[PDB]
């Protein structure tokens, strides 16, 4: 059976675990529990052929910076994630995640993933962002960042509503298998 190693990285609180668990199990986790490291597997049928999708759920916590790269050898595709309602997580795509990934895997494809799309129009979120001199990241801004890091695809999704969710993983798969 074909197999794909997909590794997921990004800041704390961005939604990496909810994204993986919502796609694989169709449930949105009820509790916010930061990850040390987890590995999930799921089967997917791709053009009639079964494919084994291996998912490497990494720690956004800086304190686990030395554990994180142990996931990287032989990776087939990276999802670098940031929250569409955290400018700081987005700035860290450039500042931290792209450089770290690319240092360990100089030619592995990267998909840029904007998470929490359900919150970009949440008036309270917008207001509290505005209070801190911030605004949600827009599609064009996301796409510009993706182009700058040489990503194969920029995708937006919500783990909570599953809008755009399957597409993230479908594209990740097509990025590796064609």
């Amino acid at each position: 059976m074909q197999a794909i190693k997909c590794v997921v990285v990004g800041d704390g609180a961005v939604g990496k675990t909810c994204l993986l668990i919502s796609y694989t199990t169709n449930a949105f986790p009820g509790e916010y529990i930061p990850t040390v490291f987890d590995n999930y597997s799921a089967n997917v049928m791709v053009d009639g052929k079964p494919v084994n999708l291996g998912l490497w759920d990494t720690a956004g916590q800086e304190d686990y910076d030395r554990l994180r790269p142990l996931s990287y050898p032989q990776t087939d595709v990276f999802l670098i994630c940031f929250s569409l309602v955290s400018p700081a997580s987005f700035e860290n795509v450039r500042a931290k995640w792209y450089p770290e990934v690319r240092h360990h895997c100089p030619h592995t494809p990267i998909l840029l993933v904007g998470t929490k799309l359900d919150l970009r129009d949440d008036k309270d979120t917008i207001e509290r962002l505005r209070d801190k001199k911030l605004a949600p990241i827009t599609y064009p801004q996301g796409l510009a960042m993706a182009r700058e890091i040489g990503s194969v695809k920029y995708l937006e999704c919500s783990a909570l509503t599953q809008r755009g969710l399957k597409t993230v993983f479908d594209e990740a798969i097509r990025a590796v298998l064609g």
Partner: protein
């Protein structure tokens, strides 16, 4: 086309013990590395 995923499996669940400052449930391959 690409189907919905099926047959989820949680293969590895790693934690950290603050008393010993040691990881717990490490992938068997990482035990010589960390």
């Amino acid at each position: 086309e690409i189907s919905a995923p099926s047959n989820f499996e949680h293969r590895v669940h790693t934690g950290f013990d603050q008393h010993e400052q040691k990881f717990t449930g490490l992938p068997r391959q990482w035990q010589s590395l960390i």
